[model samples]
Target chain A: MELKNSISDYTEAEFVQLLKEIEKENVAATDDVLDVLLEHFVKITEHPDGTDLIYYPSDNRDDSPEGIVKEIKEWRAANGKPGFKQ
Target chain B: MELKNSISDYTEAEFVQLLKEIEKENVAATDDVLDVLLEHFVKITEHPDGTDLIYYPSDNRDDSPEGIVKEIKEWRAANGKPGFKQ
Candidate 1:
């Protein structure tokens, strides 16, 4: 369970800069992806330092790149992606 | 204080369109920014419409472009930004 990730490695000013880059480049995010991340972020706030301690599915495969692909495949199979909503 | 903002005004399809624009453009979002908005979105699901009901800062200053800028400046003053991740 890779439990910790810090956005603080990027400074506040740099964070804002990345946002501007996102805004300028018009980066898109999926509802499922955002929902997953937001849920994790909310959980992080319960900790002392506000760093994410998200746990992957115990299959130990969830941490692997192939595991992620499989997870996404499963999610698509189960959730029925709307295909970018556009 | 403004009470509502409808992403539905854009439609699920259109909402994804905007998201894609953001992604293609590499749009980034700040923690403060994401937090504020995410809080509001979480509030909305409590409603039947799933639309946001976020109230403005009472001074009617959270909706306008200048208002957002001012809010960001104030946030920077108080929060001490750390910049983007990566």
Candidate 2:
């Protein structure tokens, strides 16, 4: 099978680095990188689309990569899984 | 956190049953159900989006629910795992 874009495309370190740029709300600078980071959050949480704001907690229900990563951190907190590059 | 449309929404038997209807290419009747089936295949394959037909075998590559099931069967054959209702 041919592999296309996936969360595996980035390391956690890279995700975090690019994520900082995203924190500045710099879309033009990191839009493509955000795709991988957002995909990474969606994969970690085992959700499809992960776009329905209602499905996320009220505080975490924003359609941003930072929001998604925040939601995933909640999952990791509850699930007790040390997920890194995988 | 809350959950929205996930593959867990259906039973294995249910996905198979509606899948047969998909075999007839009856999108008019089962378009909504197809979402769950497709999402099921995407989740089982552990890939983001799973929209790239190139990742599937030339013959297995189609955006149909039936086609995705066929591709997942290929994965099951190799993975040696009884993935039912999961």
Off by over 4 Å in 1: A1-16, A23-86, B1-4, B12-31, B45-86
When just chain B is superposed on the true chain B, each candidate scores a TM-score of: 0.27, 0.36
Task: Report the error of model 1 at residue A55, Å.
Answer: 31
Q: What share of the true interface contacts does each candidate keep?
A: 0.07, 0.00
* Per-model C-alpha RMSD: 18.8, 18.6
- Top candidate on TM-score is 2
lDDT tens readout by residue for model 1, B1-86:
12235423333333333323323222233355444445554442233322222233436455532343344335434655421111
Q: What is the Cα root-mean-square deviation between model 2 and the actual structure?
A: 18.6
Please provide, for model 1 over A1-86, each residue's C-alpha lDDT reduced to its tens digit, 9 standing for 90 to 100: 02234433333333333323323222234455444444454442233322222233445455532343344335444655421111
DockQ of each: 0.05, 0.01
